[PDB]
Design a binder for these strands. Structure first.
Lengths: 80, 108, 46, 93, 93, 106, 94, 99, 79
DNA sequence: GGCCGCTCAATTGGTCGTAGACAGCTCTAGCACCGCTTAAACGCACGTACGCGCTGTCCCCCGCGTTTTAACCGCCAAGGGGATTACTCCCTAGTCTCCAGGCACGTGTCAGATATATACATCCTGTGCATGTAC
DNA sequence: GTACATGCACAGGATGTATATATCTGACACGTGCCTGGAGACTAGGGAGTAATCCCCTTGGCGGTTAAAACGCGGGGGACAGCGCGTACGTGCGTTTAAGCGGTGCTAGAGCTGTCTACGACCAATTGAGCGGCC
């Protein structure tokens, strides 16, 4: 249900602070949750179709990594 | 008649020429792989592996740790104007980010 | 020649620009839609 | 039973050849195994296209030389070409 | 003092490297977003970690480019109107 | 007597040519008898849809000869084509007519 | 030699979609390059999908997943609908 | 018809005219002559197919349009209607195209 | 020097297609660097496919494959 | 009010145990890799012909140098909205845990789907010619 | 008002096809044991909330100079023939890699011993502020 709101204001605040911004206008928080939900929506929609193709109930770390290669946003270390 | 020597040792490489030939031939990159191909490719993987590890080693040693951790790899890619083009869209697990402040934020 | 009709299209679209009565792109029929586009318009109506 | 078939021993040998005192955490080993395997897929992938765009069957040293010359950036291309030409030169004697 | 503890905080999270999002909120969020692609999926624990690293890296990369947008508009303060620029000229939407 | 895979499946797209292209492209050492039928049908559907939109854009601009501009209007209006084709470029297609807001006078 | 290409099928589809309508040789260049690009994209992804499962065969299932990965949105559903209709005709015709 | 005109109006008329039509904006021979300078620095005496040098032009103009179209958006966002080099450098960095 | 042959009017048009209402005078020069560094990518890749083919002449395929590798695919020329 | 000598309540110090996590074995065993066959087809060398691309001579509309001028940028000044920061109080995230169940993997076995050898025929690509569309 | 570009008619060669053949891949049903989903108990680290206040952004106002738009001038971009250097082919050829079947090297798993850092805790010294003695 509510879980998009479960990404805490401080979490997005830290996550932006690593990216090196100094001040956050408070409308960033509710909007950022939308962007992150769109990025997971794309990655999961891809990774679930790899998983369904393999006739398999479990999403493995390889299936999400392959989805990330498929999107041209590659990730190392999680196998492959 | 017998007693082998590995194709890596004949090439003068640490990288596995056999493994690379087996992967090129089974990967369907072509129906045929010429005998010079896996030798040359093994050398290229070794060179890039040497470069990225040497810079990781220097990054770790300058951070006073005797061991490579993903942080010391990420700090070796982003501090090189060449490898940062080769790896311009890779994410390193647990790597963090290159330390940098935009000068307009910097105080007074 | 008949190019006065394309010159009139320019005059109409400039008259609408001097009036300011236009879409956000500045530019000026369901029967013609594909089955996919009918499904997307149905998905927009829901 | 299946086998992981990693590059771990070879990248470990290469580190030990350039920083003889230094270690690899298994996490950094994972990163390096991905990097090697990803550059292999990129180079071999481009070598396949360099065959089809010339309607050759094989990939040979000059296809991989061209794949390197395209795929790498500046100095890394001329260094990698120097390494590949050294290796095939030694292998052919 | 204000903004100085923020600027000292940036140095703290750029020297640090661990995950910035709480595991269980992210774990639930991945399952929540999966539900209407498929019911009843099982997630391998390492896959959720990989997805989390991809997200935190993507968001850091977006905020890094969003900072450029706000600073280009002579603001040290980022706003939704900056995110809409960065995600547009990324070509993402 | 023979019947072509294309006309048997009911496609206008060339199932035999797709079969050879999958077999000879080294996408695999083995190609399933269904795969080139299925792929021909998807190439056909995409070609039918991108042409239907282009032909509509051509007739809506009172021309009967489709030219690259009409394909560029079709591709950039419908957002699922615009996502599929994304970053590709059409020779002499130009750009979708779009005066940005705020520049637009008051 | 022979310049092997899709041009007559593309034109034959156009005359099925809009019987009055005609098409420039530049647009035929585009349609060829577009079909060849989509084809190399889908077969490319199908080959990776076979490797990820350690299969040899490009079966019709491999194309179905490569299609619902590469095509966006509801266009993916309509393409898969056309493919499953087509294979249904073919396997029903023997 | 008029004299002196109202500035900005002929710019909007130009936008409509150059978006409605698909001709190459760069004159062909200057570009045909430019490409050979970029060639001499990496292979001497190259020969270009009549299509290829024009396909490079179609890619260049599609790239430059596809940069000014984002640059414009940075200027509008930056409370301006005028593009400047400080916009172009930014659009590049946000795209990941250099720096 | 043939890069100064990319005329100030040509960059006006080539930006006006992109919809910019007003130019600033520094753009007309600085844009030439951006065009030159874009060409200096696709030419070196296209020439690399050409030399690999052992051709002397750069074909339409030699530049279209460079553009496909650059991730900016061009239709209509060749395939 | 000012000095100093015992008390007992005070930090700061050094050696032990352990756990994470490589590190270097150290097997040891099972499986890929190498060698040496015989075979056959790719790519190479090398002519030959033809497109095709340089390098050539005519020419108008576009490029461009100069001019005014007006609308936009950049600068500044003022001010109230809003983000920071500093606590405070609470809760749900982290953890480790155990069940206990689901299912990913593996192996034995099969059959059906697909490679491939080859003989026909029908499809579609090069040419040529007719005629209407875009300009 | 015109004719170049598409669109149709025809030949013919190549490739798509039907059929028979042989087989190995993928599908199926079996078990092993891995490991993920649920649900619980507790601590306490991070989160939500608030009040206080600073300063940032937004706005409005101004002057300066910069780009636009107009203008006349003239140069060079756009469009037509001649040579020869390539690019595509055809052939003949031999070197190269495949396939196949062995023997050994080596690599992965598992396990072990081993440090060895690095982090708490205990054991054993000491230092000092707490105070009474004295005049």
């Amino acid at each position: 249900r509510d879980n998009i709101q479960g990404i805490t204001k401080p979490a997005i605040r830290r996550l932006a602070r690593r990216g090196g911004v100094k001040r956050i206008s408070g409308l960033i928080y509710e909007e950022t949750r939308g962007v992150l939900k769109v990025f997971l929506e794309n990655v999961i929609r891809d990774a679930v179709t790899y998983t369904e193709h393999a006739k398999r109930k479990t999403v493995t770390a390889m299936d999400v990594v392959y989805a990330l290669k498929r999107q041209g946003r590659t990730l190392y270390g999680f196998g492959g | 008649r017998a007693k082998a020597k590995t194709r890596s040792s004949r090439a003068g490489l640490q990288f596995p020429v056999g493994r690379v030939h087996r992967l090129l031939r089974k990967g369907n990159y072509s129906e045929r792989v010429g005998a010079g191909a896996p030798v040359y490719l093994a050398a290229v993987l070794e060179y890039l592996t040497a470069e990225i590890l040497e810079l990781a080693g220097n990054a770790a040693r300058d951070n006073k740790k005797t061991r490579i951790i993903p942080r010391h790899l990420q700090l070796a890619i982003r501090n090189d104007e060449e490898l940062n083009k080769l790896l311009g869209r890779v994410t390193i697990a647990q790597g963090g980010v290159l330390p940098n402040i935009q000068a307009v934020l910097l105080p007074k | 020649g008949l190019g006065g009709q394309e010159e009139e299209e320019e005059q109409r679209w400039l008259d609408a620009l001097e009036k300011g009565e236009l879409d956000d792109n500045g530019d000026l029929n369901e029967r013609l839609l594909t089955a996919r586009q009918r499904a997307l318009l149905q998905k927009a109506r829901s | 039973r299946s086998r992981k078939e990693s590059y771990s021993i070879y990248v470990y040998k290469v580190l030990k050849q350039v920083h003889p005192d230094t270690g690899i955490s298994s996490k950094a080993m994972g990163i390096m195994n991905s990097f090697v395997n990803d550059i292999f897929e990129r180079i071999a992938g481009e070598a396949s296209r360099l065959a089809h765009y010339n309607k050759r069957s094989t990939i040979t040293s000059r296809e991989i030389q061209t794949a390197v010359r395209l795929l790498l950036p500046g100095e890394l291309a001329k260094h990698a070409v120097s390494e590949g030409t050294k290796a095939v030169t030694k292998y052919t004697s | 003092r204000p903004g100085t503890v923020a600027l000292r905080e940036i140095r703290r999270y750029q020297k640090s490297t661990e995950l910035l999002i709480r595991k269980l909120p992210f774990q639930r969020l991945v399952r929540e977003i999966a539900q209407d692609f498929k019911t009843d999926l099982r997630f391998q624990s390492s896959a959720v970690m990989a997805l989390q690293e991809a997200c935190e890296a993507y968001l850091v990369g977006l905020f890094e480019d969003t900072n450029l947008c706000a600073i280009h508009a002579k603001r040290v303060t980022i706003m939704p109107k900056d995110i809409q620029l960065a995600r547009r000229i990324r070509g993402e939407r």
